[PDB]
């Protein structure tokens, strides 16, 4: 029963592909297993830029030894639910606030 935003095995390119597809918009996001760092996760989010138009940005979600997650060292969370709630409430460094999970 994965959360609506959790796409365990989706590649970075397929995340981009789906996030940029109809049904999604600015703020649309998903969390998937990182293709760069084994055992960690990546956050993919759609954003609208002045010149780029529609774009997707990726953030590495780093793991804290013995439990915990952070995108920026300055603020950590005990779990992904807390992290998603935090960035849903404030962009706090990110390119935009997390709005709705990727629609498929």
């Amino acid at each position: 029963e994965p959360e609506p935003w959790f796409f365990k095995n989706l590649s970075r390119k397929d995340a981009e592909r789906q996030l940029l597809a109809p049904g999604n918009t600015h703020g649309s996001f998903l969390i998937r297993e990182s293709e760069s760092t084994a055992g960690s996760f990546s956050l993919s989010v759609r954003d609208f830029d002045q010149n780029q138009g529609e774009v997707v940005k990726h953030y590495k979600i780093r793991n804290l030894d013995n439990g915990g997650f952070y995108i920026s060292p300055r603020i950590t969370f005990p779990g992904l639910h807390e992290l998603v709630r935090h960035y849903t409430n404030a962009s706090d460094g990110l390119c935009t606030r997390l709005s709705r999970p990727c629609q498929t």
Binding site: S42, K57, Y59, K60, I71, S72, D92, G93
Partner: peptide, 4 residues
């Protein structure tokens, strides 16, 4: 990757 982008940095937050």
């Amino acid at each position: 990757y982008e940095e937050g």
